[PDB]
Design a protein around this ligand. Structure first.
Ligand code: 5NK
Lengths: 419, 419, 419
């Protein structure tokens, strides 16, 4: 299942065995709540003034990450909202949602949307008010809460709450939206992840109807191989401080096979791991040639120019990986690995080393205690000469950030042909 | 209204037609809740123990962004809190808020604050408890909720909720605070934005009074012209990879005319757009000469030194603008623009191009789907030779970040006079 | 108590007088809720269907910062969760929590955990349901709220709410967990800070038991001296623009004495100040030699290589410190300090200056108004020649980021021996 390789020569590790789930698109749906135009008994009198005020307010209401592009997260959802402001467009919805709650309406600008009437307060208030109290206070409370979410979030919320869309409604919404059966089961078995990648956009109150758009994720890439790249500073370990040179692979992040290429997510926080399934958003990704994976096995390969940064700053630190820990120990720092019940079992030397989570519960670098992940899986240590040893410190470029193996090699050549 | 120009020569676009609303200052107000010192009937017995415990806990309680300065967001509000800890200062408030709820108190350190008694539980509990239940459970619930917000936020909350300050109270607070009529209407028509720029600071419980300060935004700059600058990487498109050079304008962000100068907001996320009104915070801004706008029309102009970064990293991406999309297509990437109902309508060539939101619903760069904003407005394409063609790649500085047109020109000159 | 020194020569200031409180480790505890397997009267009928649905969903559910390492924040807590999925492990807990609510269970993998039964709905529903309503609706509400938190957060919450763990339970939990009496009082007097550094991890529903792990902070470093370093750009102030050179100390952040070394926190936002106590997390820290403090008194000292960045970008800004304000005024910018009731009292000249919070309420740099902190304490102005005057602009490296005094001196020497 989940496996991990560590590369001694580049101070990096790769975790594989993951399956993709990439948000590639959005499904937009119009959620409606029907309202009443009103203008043990006392229990409703105070719950009815709660109502009037909610409507009152609802109306008053209306390393490599820098290489990423810039999207507009809710542009699709807002595009649907602008349509519902057209005249007769709200009444078209109101009409279709007459004898049923779930209906697909064709909107006037060539947009077919799944519309859902999730609460019928109009039918409730006009039939009952003008046991019963129990239903009012509960249906009303949902209205108050949807209102609260929208007012402290300026009409745009995420993750989409159970108030905006109940588990019942969401699951049904998922089942009725037209996607593959794989997508349907994936979404159904991960509704909280779905909720976190969703948007709720307050749209309109007009003609006794409250409407908001829910923007749900389309996962157009499913079950392709994914892998995470961890990198840590690789430094020489000479005696005199300040005489050392350092190199870090800057291409750390999530990598997923996708449509003949590889999706790269430089900010691994924009991805959510569930056992062995990785949920990412393609908005936070670059599209690279699959040759990028060649940088793990051979960082000097002629097909892809592996990206690195350089410095003279040899501080110690650790990177906790999926199945172990990379340790970059430099200078006078104390770095150890421990077992929970027996204590220190490995003291690290200067340089960059690695330990697996088998038998190890924590790692210590200086004054920093890291707990390691205790997921089961196999680790492989790939011995190799640390590539930083291949450079003369006297002509090593000591502050490169957006750089690569070739860019450094050219800078060096310019400095050598020089002498 | 909203208009947009794209500049082919610098791979950038400018959206104009916006009106400012800058938070320049803070208004601090002391909000008080009066408490009781106590020590169908059973409904109050359990709601009264809710009360005692809330009081219990309330007492237990007490690119260019790096160029920004560093403020202390609630320094003004906390400065008022320290005054209420002085002896007799709480009783001064308690005294003025006797026969009315809304009063301006002069605090002992030369601070005139609008004070508001938003809930009188002391008068309620001592007159009623020592129909009725309905009022208790509702007034009490507000107390419990204010308490919850403060305990999970360590006494400082934002956005300021409806519990801290009701729509009623906030609107009235806005109307009574002494600012211009323009500010009053601006704040009143945008109370949720106001709420998001506000702070609630738990201050004190002493002498049967709960006091917290609400820190509200002063908008001292209103209705001046604003514009957003979008930039994207400009790269040469030579055949052999790694032989290319790239240049990005780094001065992207919001720009607002302000007091003879221009306020620049390098992190466009610190600004909130409402139709054509832009809410920014001057804490997240630099003050530049208005000559900075010369960089859009002529990036080689002699009055301002336009800021850029350089690299050799030609990855594709898109920037979704206000009225269209900038596309930076490089290497073997597939980049398209589509209409919702007809599909691909433009395939982009290598280099940096632009498409408007008229007729276009989405843009695709590699595996990344961007929806474009569907706001109405006019786009203008300004043809020009891409300036990256004006540089010899053999003497081009390939990793500059905090740089400019002149700094690069000097670095080149140093490399040319050399040879 | 709190004191501050400003260094004119390096445009930096140091705030001392603080006491540490570092999260060094985690305490994990298993919190259990016992459930019923069921399948004025009507009040319970609707509150009982609330129950069934909550269980339904609960089951469906299951500058220098770049130098930091990367941890896994809840690796310890999740490691305990995996144990409770073993067979008989839930029943071991269920067994010990029979005749009492608070018990220490030895888990099968050599982990002794404090286990807490915080709500007994099983005993309630099976004894009462199969005055009374008041208790049900209140105990049930807690269940619904724990459920809501977990569903919109995918089973991991922070800060840990009063629903996950009441003030009562938390205080008792703190008292029973085996730490020093200093830690116990520190945690007890700061429970909201404790809550913010805590994690709640949804673990399991099996055999009529709901279990989640609460991950609480261990403060292994307490009451050591702490100090905050503020830095601001130091630039020459020549007439012609673009002819100036700039230098910024990049080592700003929190510094705490710790186990013979100094813990450095480059992102001062990962630290929370309470009067004179500083709460930090060692995960967001580097371990440095105590010699790093030598950079404040003598930035040219031979024991530690003080870190700086260089540029040609002389923009004005201010840094609000603990007891005053650093002002970096350059070019044509208007920079002032004011008193609340008398207005402008100091106009700053070009260069980097400082003002204390005694008599000063605000500082203005360009269009940016900063309020200063009004904490009492002594400020000391240490006069010195600004070190940027010691460099020839013609051989000054104008874009260094990850650099230091020596690295710049070497780059200069390479440029001088050259000529
Ligand atoms: C906030 C901030 C401010 C200023 C700045 O530059 C950067 C970008 N940047 C640079 N600078 C690059 C590369 C070095 N120089 C190349 C000629 N020596 C100059 C341009 N080195 C960096 C390292 C090491 C880590 C993270 C970011 C880095 N970030």
């Amino acid at each position: 299942n989940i496996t991990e390789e560590f590369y001694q020569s580049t101070c990096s590790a790769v975790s594989k065995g993951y399956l993709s789930a990439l948000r590639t698109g959005w499904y937009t749906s119009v959620i409606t709540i029907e309202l009443s135009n009103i203008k043990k008994v006392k229990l409703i009198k105070q719950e009815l003034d709660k109502y009037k005020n909610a409507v009152t307010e609802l109306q008053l209401l209306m390393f490599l990450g820098f290489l990423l592009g810039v999207g507009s997260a809710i542009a699709s959802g807002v595009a649907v909202c602008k349509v519902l402001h057209l005249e007769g467009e709200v009444n078209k919805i109101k009409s279709a949602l007459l004898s049923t709650n779930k209906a697909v309406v064709s909107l006037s600008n060539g947009v077919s949307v799944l519309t859902f009437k999730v609460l019928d307060l109009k039918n409730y208030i006009d039939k009952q008010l003008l046991e019963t109290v129990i239903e009012f206070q509960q249906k009303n409370n949902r209205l108050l809460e949807i209102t609260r979410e929208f007012s402290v979030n300026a009409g745009v919320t995420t993750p989409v709450s159970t108030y905006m869309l109940t588990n019942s409604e969401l699951l049904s919404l998922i089942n009725d939206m037209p996607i593959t059966n794989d997508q349907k089961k994936l979404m159904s078995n991960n509704v909280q992840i779905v909720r976190q990648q969703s948007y709720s956009i307050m749209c309109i109150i007009k003609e006794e109807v409250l409407a908001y758009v829910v923007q749900l994720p389309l996962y157009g890439v499913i079950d392709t191989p994914c892998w995470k790249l961890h990198t840590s500073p690789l430094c020489t370990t000479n005696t005199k401080e300040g005489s050392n040179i350092c190199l870090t692979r800057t291409d750390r992040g999530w990598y997923c096979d996708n449509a003949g290429s590889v999706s790269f997510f430089p900010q691994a926080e924009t991805c959510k791991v569930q056992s062995n399934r990785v949920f990412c958003d393609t908005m936070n990704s670059l599209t690279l040639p699959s040759e990028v994976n060649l940088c793990n096995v051979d960082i000097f390969n002629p097909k892809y120019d592996c990206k690195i940064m350089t410095s003279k700053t040899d501080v110690s630190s650790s990177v906790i990986t999926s199945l172990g820990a990379i340790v970059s120990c430099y200078g006078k720092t104390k770095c150890t690995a421990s077992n929970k019940n027996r204590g220190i079992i490995k003291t690290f030397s200067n340089g960059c080393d690695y330990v697996s989570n088998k038998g190890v519960d924590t790692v210590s670098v200086g004054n920093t205690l890291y707990y390691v992940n205790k997921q089961e899986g196999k680790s492989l240590y790939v011995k190799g000469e640390p590539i930083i040893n291949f450079y003369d410190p006297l002509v090593f470029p000591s502050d490169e950030f957006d750089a690569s193996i070739s860019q450094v090699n050219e800078k060096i050549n310019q400095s050598l042909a020089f002498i």
